[PDB]
């Protein structure tokens, strides 16, 4: 019998008969309280009673129902969440009903840490990941960048080995918003944990896919960071055609990302004994000044450092 904390007929615990035996334990804030919260009547009521059942380690069905109210009053109280998991095991509660519960609270507080960790503990206990990818997709449908949702998704996929359809899901979300960096991250997570980027066809597929995206939305930093990320491995200079291919978007799709990418390719050519070293150095130093002075001034101190550093190296 869950009398909702929001129920118009909700009554304070101290006014409840089935609780009349127990004496509520108030909070010990000391004689000279600091950062002391002037709790509401309800909050203060539920917690004084929570303290009482916890202090006597009373593992009852009534205590279990109470933690729910204390969680709803403050979902970040990890001590309450802990005692709740204690009661889930002692009382041998139906963990599937608890999944329904945690599904509801997460929808309400998708950015709370405790709610997600609890769901994880439930999935571990039941060794059942069947509802996970779908539940998470519903959270990401509301906020496609929820960090906890993405973390949970990554944990479920790696733990239960659910890799088969993730690249497709990633393609789906990239269509919705090609600027969703969380999705570019998921793309790399899936690939690196399945085929890897050493497979030349995959690498080629990924570099071409990314280049088409850069063509469509040239100022999307994610696509640029992903391009640099997957090639940076072997070294950007290892790919001779790339420089030319980017130098071609120089007039058309030319953002300060293309410029910065060119200095990156240059930095690596210099480090890898490239031909035309003096020539290459000047180009890279020219771009560092255009960036520092004109195209990307917010990063002036960074680009100057790159300038200095580059001279100091290949002078």
């Amino acid at each position: 019998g869950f009398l909702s904390l929001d129920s118009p007929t909700y009554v304070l615990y101290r006014d409840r008969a089935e609780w009349a035996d127990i004496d509520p334990v108030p909070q010990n804030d000391g004689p000279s309280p600091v950062v002391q919260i002037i709790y509401s009547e309800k909050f203060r009521d539920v917690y004084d009673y929570f303290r009482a059942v916890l202090q006597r380690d009373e593992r009852s069905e009534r205590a279990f129902k109470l933690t729910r109210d204390a969680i709803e009053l403050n979902a970040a109280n990890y001590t309450v969440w802990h005692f709740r998991r204690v009661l889930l095991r002692s009382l041998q509660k139906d963990l599937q009903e608890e999944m329904n519960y945690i599904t509801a609270i997460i929808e309400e507080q998708p950015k709370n840490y405790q709610v997600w960790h609890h769901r994880r503990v439930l999935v571990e206990w039941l060794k059942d990941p069947s509802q996970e990818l779908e539940f998470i997709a519903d959270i990401l449908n509301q906020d496609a960048k929820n960090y906890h949702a993405w973390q949970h998704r990554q944990w479920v996929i790696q733990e239960f080995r659910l890799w088969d359809n993730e690249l497709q899901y990633v393609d789906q979300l990239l269509k919705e918003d090609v600027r969703n960096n969380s999705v570019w991250n998921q793309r790399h997570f899936v690939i690196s944990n399945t085929t890897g980027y050493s497979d030349r066809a995959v690498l080629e597929r990924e570099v071409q896919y990314t280049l088409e995206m850069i063509k469509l939305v040239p100022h999307n930093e994610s696509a640029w960071n992903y391009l640099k990320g997957i090639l940076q491995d072997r070294g950007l200079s290892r790919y001779p055609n790339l420089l030319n291919q980017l130098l071609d978007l120089q007039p058309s799709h030319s953002s300060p990302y293309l410029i910065a990418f060119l200095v990156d390719i240059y930095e690596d050519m210099l480090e890898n004994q490239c031909d035309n070293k003096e020539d290459i150095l000047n180009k890279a130093l020219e771009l560092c000044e255009i960036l520092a002075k004109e195209k990307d001034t917010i990063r002036k101190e960074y680009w100057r450092y790159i300038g200095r550093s580059l001279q100091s190296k290949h002078s």
């Binding site: 403050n74 802990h82 994880r120 973390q151 090609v178 990320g229 990307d296 990063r299 101190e301 960074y302």
Partner: protein, 401 residues
């Protein structure tokens, strides 16, 4: 004012005529920020960048004693409210009466668990976040009374109870793992001098696995690079003297790319919105990377500035992140809170003060009364407090068990 220059309008978002939730939300932000920048011109006054010290101080001195039921959501984060406030007053150069100080000490004693570490309130199980906040708070107070609150033998035991075989640490028993725990532990263990030879074994390696394709660091391996996690990961490595376990260059490129060309403040992760608290988590990384690269004997490092735009950040904070009523915030339109007051102020201080050995170069935008007390980039408490706390605890030996 960089933000007010005419050519600055050129820094507005270019959506390539392809709108997505991302470009649309950013645009809304830029539009709101632009209105703030131009308010002066539209009201024909001379821009006067002033840090409302007194407004900020009434808000703080008051929250330090009592709060409305609006703060019920922080009932499990009380040592945080102490740290946030005491640190904000510290940056503002406001003193702690010996009476308030002793009271804070007594409260934190109630939060301290008999098994080491601190809970988020009297009688709450210990957790690493409030443990970090409690120890930091006690070091800001810096009295022998404060130092003595911390039960060092139980704290070491506690840290060991969270240590994992792969090198990570849980946030609390039966809890989650992420880069924050490594930092909370390395911060409290180092400040209190309880670091045993094997305590952080493999921790540097675990944090290194959190660095991804972006250059930044995620909460756990595989996760998107984030500013809060990246600060925790790098700062923890600096504490352990293993910064070299990271690709410092890709990290330097990632963090500097997080400063918003238009707003001037920092975003938490690529393609997300600017946020005032990141004035510290992201900008705080530059002094750390400076120290590290310089430790590697980098000859190209500046001798007067951090590798981010100090002027633009100070302008975003001063024009966009202050609540007239006192307190700082995420961005225009957001509500003030003690978290943002602590971090906006912390990020301002980092932005004003530069240092590299013998070099010292301030940059105080607006009225010179704007200059705040300096903050240590690793611990985020006054540098003096760090030296003072570590020297004190070094008088004590590392608990042997």
């Amino acid at each position: 004012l960089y933000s007010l220059r005419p050519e600055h309008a050129r820094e507005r978002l270019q959506d390539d005529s392809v709108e997505t939730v991302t470009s649309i939300e950013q645009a809304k932000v830029e539009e709101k920020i632009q209105e703030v920048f131009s308010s002066y011109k539209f009201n024909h006054l001379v821009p006067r960048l002033v840090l409302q010290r007194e407004k900020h101080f009434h808000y703080l001195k008051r929250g330090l004693r009592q709060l409305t039921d609006a703060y019920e959501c922080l009932d499990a984060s009380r040592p945080w409210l102490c740290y946030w406030i005491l640190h904000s007053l510290e940056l503002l150069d406001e003193p702690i009466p010996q009476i308030v100080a002793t009271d804070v000490c007594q409260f934190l004693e109630l939060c301290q668990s008999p098994d080491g570490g601190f809970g988020g309130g009297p009688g709450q199980y210990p957790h690493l976040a409030p443990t970090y906040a409690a120890v930091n708070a006690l070091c800001i107070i810096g009295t022998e009374e404060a130092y003595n609150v911390i039960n060092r033998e139980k704290l070491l035991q506690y840290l060991y109870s969270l240590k994992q075989p792969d090198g990570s640490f849980l946030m609390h028993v039966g809890g989650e793992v992420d880069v924050r725990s490594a930092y909370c532990a390395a911060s409290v263990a180092s400040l209190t001098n309880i670091i045993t030879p094997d305590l952080f074994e493999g921790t540097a390696e675990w944090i290194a696995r959190c660095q991804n394709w972006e250059g930044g660091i995620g909460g756990v391996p595989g996760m998107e690079a984030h500013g809060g996690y990246t600060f925790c990961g790098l700062a923890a490595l600096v504490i352990l003297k293993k910064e070299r376990s990271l690709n410092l260059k890709s990290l330097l490129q990632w963090v500097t790319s997080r400063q918003m060309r238009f707003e001037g403040g920092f975003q938490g992760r690529c393609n997300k919105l600017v946020d005032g608290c990141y004035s510290f988590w992201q900008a705080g990384l530059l002094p750390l990377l400076h120290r590290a690269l310089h430790a590697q004997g980098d000859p190209a490092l500046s001798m007067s500035h951090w590798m981010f735009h100090q002027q633009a950040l100070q302008e975003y904070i001063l024009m966009c992140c202050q609540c007239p009523a006192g307190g700082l915030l995420d961005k225009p339109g957001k509500s003030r809170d003690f978290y943002h007051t602590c971090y906006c102020l912390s990020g301002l201080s980092i932005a004003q003060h530069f240092g590299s050995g013998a070099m010292l170069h301030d940059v105080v935008m607006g009225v010179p009364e704007n200059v705040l007390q300096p903050t240590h980039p690793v611990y985020n408490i006054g540098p003096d407090k760090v030296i003072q706390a570590t020297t004190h605890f070094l008088q004590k030996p590392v608990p042997g068990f």
